[PDB]
């Protein structure tokens, strides 16, 4: 997380750290599934237990953590690992059920009526261990509170100058300040863009950290997140059948 502050115990009990060929993050679903980005996990996708999955801790360098082992990795078939992040979503199945406790609770899947909380300019939260404002990976968990950006306003800010055409798509949502300074960065991919359901006082993930400007937090550039609600039947079909 770029330009944020350090989280305290219990703030993000669904945060998952994933280590393999890439440094990435994830969000726990139920007690045996991890929600993350497809581009971050496609590396070593056919090796089931290749990923080092660590959760329930606030420090990346910590020797004490809760270990989880992956039984299988599911990548969305719509994703194309050439260039672009269309349909950037992946589900990781954990071999053993996680011990839900004070520092480990899953994030809720978004309801179909939860878009009343994902409105433009409303505040959302992103969290993860990424490149900080000083230029190095975070030694402890960081987070930002950022507002959602209009889809038309986000599309206009991309495809130029260096970005390829069709980078923004209907499966995405955006967030970030107009002036920059609050954004995700390299290492936060798969992290959960969470929103507060004030009617139930519960948190749910609405976006998955995907891509953005190569220069993190640049003014006039916004972070792009994979929208979860489009894949709710796809998530339920994999969890129920596999």
């Amino acid at each position: 997380i770029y330009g944020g502050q350090k989280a305290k115990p219990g703030d993000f009990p669904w945060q998952v750290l994933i280590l393999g060929g890439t440094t990435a993050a994830g969000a726990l679903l139920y007690d045996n599934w991890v929600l993350t980005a497809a581009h971050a996990v496609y590396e070593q996708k056919h090796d089931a237990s290749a990923l080092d999955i660590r959760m329930g801790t606030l420090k990346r360098l910590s020797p004490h953590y809760t270990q989880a082992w992956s039984e299988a990795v599911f990548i969305h078939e719509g994703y194309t690992h050439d260039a672009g992040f269309d349909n950037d979503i992946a589900l990781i199945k954990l071999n053993n059920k996680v011990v839900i406790n004070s520092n480990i609770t899953p994030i809720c899947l978004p309801r179909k009526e939860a878009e009343s909380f994902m409105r433009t300019d409303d505040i959302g939260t992103a969290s993860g261990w990424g490149l900080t404002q000083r230029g190095f990976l975070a030694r402890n968990l960081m987070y930002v509170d950022i507002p959602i950006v209009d889809h038309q306003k986000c599309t206009a800010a991309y495809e130029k100058p260096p970005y390829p055409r069709g980078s923004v798509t209907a499966n995405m949502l955006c967030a970030g300040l107009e002036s920059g300074g609050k954004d995700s960065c390299r290492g936060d991919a798969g992290g959960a863009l969470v929103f507060l359901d004030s009617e139930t006082e519960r948190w749910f993930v609405g976006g998955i950290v995907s891509w953005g400007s190569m220069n993190c937090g640049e003014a006039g550039q916004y972070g792009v997140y994979t929208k979860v609600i489009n894949y709710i039947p796809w998530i339920e079909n994999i969890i129920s059948d596999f």
Binding site: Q44, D47, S49, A50, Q67, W69
Partner: protein
């Protein structure tokens, strides 16, 4: 080769000498690598070719890494190198490493080392049907008074006297579990003796050692009392008593508690167990 996602680890070998006896002299560090791994040749040359003299020579013939040290220091001196697994091997067993004075091989030191904790190398890689084949040599795991799908009436007597025909039958209480190289050791105390062959003067309050391979999924928790019967092994412990290996020809079953045995469902089954123990413990297999 290409891709395949190879497994890589990093070694660290430290040597030092306590006391001034056997001072200096050329010593050889013999490291037996874990199964499937071979030491990376590139990093090994950095120990000898650089201006830093961390080793004088190295040989990589076989699964062994031979390191030539000119002298063994009093304070720790450590050498590290990468190792890469060519063919994936899971459930890896610990291996030995040995440091010895070349011209005085009586001064030596051998030690075991294992894979890093919470590493995927300790997890299995067997396919579903292969795992079922793998435990064909492993002891059967059952809770108290549990009936198998093929266990017809009189199954305990059939196991003891027909097949695999038990040679020793004990009733022990598990005291403590120790982890040895590729084996788990359970220190037990015998509470009742049913039959024995090689283990003469086996009695109550006598202590024995029961071992099982690390691959098998059986675990004997301390504080519980088990019925154990099988065939006597060939090894002995520190006091001279024989040791026992638990495999597919061994019958292990935790004995039911008083509260569970008088339950309506298990009362009939608990009677079969005690009737068998009195029958076999008194008259043996002379049916």
């Amino acid at each position: 080769v290409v891709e395949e996602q190879e497994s890589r680890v990093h070694y660290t070998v430290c040597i030092w000498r306590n006391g001034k006896v056997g001072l200096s002299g050329m010593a050889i560090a013999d490291v037996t690598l874990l199964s499937g791994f071979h030491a990376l040749r590139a990093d090994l040359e950095k120990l000898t070719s650089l201006s830093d003299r961390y080793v004088s020579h190295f040989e990589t013939e076989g699964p062994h890494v031979l390191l030539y040290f000119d002298s063994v220091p009093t304070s720790r001196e450590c050498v590290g190198f990468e190792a890469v697994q060519e063919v994936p091997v899971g459930l890896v067993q610990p291996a030995s490493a040995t440091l010895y004075d070349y011209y005085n091989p009586e001064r030596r030191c051998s030690v075991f080392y294992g894979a890093p904790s919470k590493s995927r190398l300790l997890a299995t890689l067997c396919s579903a049907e292969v795992c079922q084949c793998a435990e064909g040599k492993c002891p059967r795991q059952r809770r108290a008074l549990e009936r198998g799908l093929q266990d017809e009436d009189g199954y305990r007597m059939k196991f003891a006297c027909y097949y695999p025909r038990v040679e020793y039958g004990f009733q022990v209480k598990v005291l403590r579990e120790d982890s040895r190289a590729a084996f788990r050791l359970f220190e037990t105390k015998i509470t009742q003796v049913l039959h024995f062959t090689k283990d003469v003067k086996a009695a109550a309050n006598q202590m024995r050692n029961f071992l099982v391979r690390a691959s098998c999924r059986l675990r004997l928790e301390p504080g519980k009392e088990y019925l154990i019967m099988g065939l006597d092994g060939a090894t002995y412990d520190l006091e001279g008593h024989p040791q026992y290996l638990l495999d597919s020809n061994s019958w292990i079953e935790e004995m039911p508690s008083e509260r569970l045995c008088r339950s309506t469902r298990q009362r009939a089954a608990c009677a079969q167990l005690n009737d068998f123990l009195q029958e076999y413990g008194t008259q043996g297999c002379q049916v």
